[PDB]
Amino acid sequence: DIVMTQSHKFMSTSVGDRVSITCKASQDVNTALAWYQQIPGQSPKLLIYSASNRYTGVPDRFTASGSGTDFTFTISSVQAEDLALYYCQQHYTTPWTFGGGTKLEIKRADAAPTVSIFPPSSEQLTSGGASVVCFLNNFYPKDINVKWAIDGAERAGGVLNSFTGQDSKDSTYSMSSTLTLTKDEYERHASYTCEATHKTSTAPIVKSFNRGAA
Amino acid sequence: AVHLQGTELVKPGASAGVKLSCKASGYTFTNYDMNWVRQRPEQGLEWIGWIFPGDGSTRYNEKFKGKATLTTDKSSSTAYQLNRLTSEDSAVYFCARRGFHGSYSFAYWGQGTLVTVSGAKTTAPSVYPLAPAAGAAGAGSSVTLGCLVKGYFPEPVTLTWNSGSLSSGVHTFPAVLADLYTLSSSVTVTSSTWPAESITCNVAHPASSTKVDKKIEPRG
Numbered sequence: 021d022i023v024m025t026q027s028h029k030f031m032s033t034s035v036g037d038r039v040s041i042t043c044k045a046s047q048d049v050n051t052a053l054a055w056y057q058q059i060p061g062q063s064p065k066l067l068i069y070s071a072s073n074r075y076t077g078v079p080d081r082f083t084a085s086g087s088g089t090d091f092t093f094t095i096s097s098v099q100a101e102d103l104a105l106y107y108c109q110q111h112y113t114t115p116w117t118f119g120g121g122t123k124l125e126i127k128r129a130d131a132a133p134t135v136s137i138f139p140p141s142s143e144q145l146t147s148g149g150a151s152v153v154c155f156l157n158n159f160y161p162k163d164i165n166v167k168w169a170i171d172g173a174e175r176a177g178g179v180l181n182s183f184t185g186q187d188s189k190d191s192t193y194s195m196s197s198t199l200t201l202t203k204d205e206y207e208r209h210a211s212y213t214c215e216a217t218h219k220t221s222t223a224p225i226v227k228s229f230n231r232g233a234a
Numbered sequence: 235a236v237h238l239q240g241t242e243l244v245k246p247g248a249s250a251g252v253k254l255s256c257k258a259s260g261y262t263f264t265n266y267d268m269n270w271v272r273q274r275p276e277q278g279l280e281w282i283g284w285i286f287p288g289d290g291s292t293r294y295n296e297k298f299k300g301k302a303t304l305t306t307d308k309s310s311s312t313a314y315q316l317n318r319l320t321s322e323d324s325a326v327y328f329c330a331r332r333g334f335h336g337s338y339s340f341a342y343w344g345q346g347t348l349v350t351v352s353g354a355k356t357t358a359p360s361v362y363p364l365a366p367a368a369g370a371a372g373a374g375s376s377v378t379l380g381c382l383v384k385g386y387f388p389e390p391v392t393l394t395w396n397s398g399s400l401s402s403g404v405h406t407f408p409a410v411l412a413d414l415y416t417l418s419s420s421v422t423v424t425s426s427t428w429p430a431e432s433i434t435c436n437v438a439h440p441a442s443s444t445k446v447d448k449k450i451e452p453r454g
Contacts, residue, residue, distance in 0.1 A: 021296070054339035063328055063343035064279070070337050107279060111338035115295040116281035136378040136420065138364040142453070144382075153364055153382055155420040157405050180416065182407040194405045196418050198382070234368035234454070 022047050024108045024119035030162065032127035033098050041093040041106050041122045043086075049112035051087045056107040058121075060185065064107060068093065098124070103186070125162070128191040132220035133159035137213075137227040140206060150206030154214035154227065157194040161219065162186070166197045169213040169228075175199065207231070236260040238329045240344035245388055246320055248353050253305075254315035256329035256344050263311030264288040266331050269340060270304060270315050274325040282327075285313055317349070324351045350388065357414055358442040359386030361435065364418075369429070369452020377425045379450045381435035383409075384416035392438045395421045400433065 023046035033039040045053070055068035066075045068084040071091060081102075083094045093106055103126060108119030133156040140150040156164060168175045183195040197214060213228040239257040246252045256268060267290070270282040283294035285304045292304050301318045315327055326346045333341025364380030371377045383391055393406050400421055409417035421433060434449040 052338070054337075056340075063346050064340070065343075066333070066339055066341045069333070069339040069341070075333065075339075075341060109279075109339070114293065115297070116338065118279040118281070120278050134376075134378070134422070136366075136380070138380055138382075139367055141362040141364065141382070144360070144362045147360065149384075151362070151382060151384070153380060153418055155378060155380065155405065155418075157378075157420060157422070180410050180412060182410050182417065184405065184407055194407075196405075196407045196420070198416070198418065200416075229367050 021115060022049060022110050022113065022117050024110055024117050026108055026119040026122045028122050029120065030123045030125055032161075033095075033103075033124050034127055035098055035100055037098050039095050039098055039124060041124075043091040043093070043108035043119050045089050045091070045110050047112075048088050049110040052110060052112035053084075053086070053091050054109045054111060055084050055093050056109065057102075058105045058107065059101075060104075067106075095124075125186050126191040128160050130220050131158060131160040131192055133157060133164065133195075133216055133218055133225060135214060135216050135225045135227045137229060139212070139229055139231075140203075145203050145206075148203045150201045150203045152199040152201075152206075152212050152214075154197045154199075155194070156197065156214075156216050156225075158187075158190065158192040159194070159218055159220070160192045162193045163219065164193075164195065165217040165224075166195070167215040167217070167224075168197070168199050169211070169215060170199075170209050171211045236331070236342050238331065238342055238344035240327075240329050240347045243348035243350070245350050245352060246317075248321045248351050251316060251318045251320050252349065254317065254327055254347050254349075256313040256315070258311045258313065258331070264308060268304075268306065268313035269330040269332075270302070270313075271328040271330055271340075272298075272323075272325055273328065273346070282315075287311070287313070315347075320349075320351050322351075324349060352387065352411075354387040354413060356441050357385060357387045358444040359383045359391055359414075359437060359439055359446070361437045361446040361448045363435070363448045363450045364420075365450050365453050368454060371425045371428055371452075375425055376422055377428055378420050378422045379428065379433055380418060380420045381437065381448065381450075382416075382418045383437050384412075385414035386416075386439055386442070387414055388441055389415055390440070391415070391417065392440075393417070393419050394436045395419070396432075396434055397436055 056064035329344030
């Protein structure tokens with residue numbers, strides 16, 4: 021199996037600027053390579069066929085080059101609607117393999133996340149459930165590390181994380197982290213901490229609370 | 235006007251298989267081979283195999299050995315995707331065809347068919363109000379409230395704040411599996427406006443015909 025590698029899951033760019041996504045085939049697939057673009061909830065769109073040919077209807081801003089083992093997709097001047105996923109794919113020898121994709125994102129001013137932590141509601145506790153929710157909103161860059169601490173020790177079991185793609189309006193990211201325990205275990209601990217590590221502060225952002233303590 | 239119409243999404247149980255459909259149109263169906271591609275959130279796009287309606291039958295990807303034995307049928311110009319075992323096969327499946335004669339690149343794609351494998355049955359969500367500890371209203375000029383929705387199936391649920399009148403400063407996150415889809419939403423307003431001016435999350439779950447409007451109140 022040939023392996024298409026797109027070393028950059030994400031690439032920061034700006035509207036009106038030039039950007040180049042790279043692809044590296046594990047083997048010489050000659051010129052049998054295609055580039056696709058994909059927007060959320062839609063199917064891929066062919067942009068480049070046979071290494072460096074624009075498919076019909078594909079605007080002059082899109083270009084591709086390479087032939088052999090290294091290929092590169094380029095956008096002369098990025099437009100708002102170009103901030104999507106671009107996939108690499110070799111069709112030299114079966115099985116056809118796709119690269120892992122590269123998502124172009126808008127670069128903006130650094131923004132610290134606003135962190136909020138929430139204890140389990142009384143209604144959930146009555147059902148025998150205990151979820152501690154932590155919101156980390158409107159931050160940039162997307163690079164962030166969320167850790168949960170229970171009575172001091174880090175907890176990794178029972179954590180479910182969810183996040184939104186870059187906002188189309190303020191170019192930030194947001195995330196939700198939920199620690200879900202049973203009421204039994206929740207009541208056997210006292211200290212619950214949500215800890216956010218982001219480049220915007222030397223010290224990680226920390227939010228906590230003590231069971232039964234205001 | 236080449237077009238590939240895929241089938242609506244389906245929710246098979248962790249055990250059986252499902253035959254997907256793709257209705258080609260706008261071109262002589264038998265002149266091009268049909269391809270199928272899989273797309274999971276963590277593994278990206280993976281080619282499954284092709285089929286010649288003129289009949290050259292198939293050729294599958296090593297990885298999709300017998301779990302994917304394609305099939306087609308002329309006189310209707312539709313291609314089918316069997317899906318055998320099914321359990322980790324939860325994802326979106328695409329129907330793909332090439333453009334020019336000499337380039338295996340896929341110029342034409344179907345809209346995709348979502349497939350979710352789960353043993354769970356339709357289940358209404360529990361909705362839990364998230365308010366800052368000890369009521370109050372934070373310690374700054376802004377306060378964040380929340381709504382936790384969990385234990386439901388299948389997707390989706392719609393969530394709004396104050397019947398939609400509260401839309402700014404809202405963050406509603408993608409639901410994550412776990413037996414009963416669970417998702418949450420946060421809303422951030424001016425500290426002095428809550429609990430002065432009530433805030434309620436409205437959660438609706440079509441599948442169960444259920445709705446829950448949970449008001450967020452100070453708590454101890």
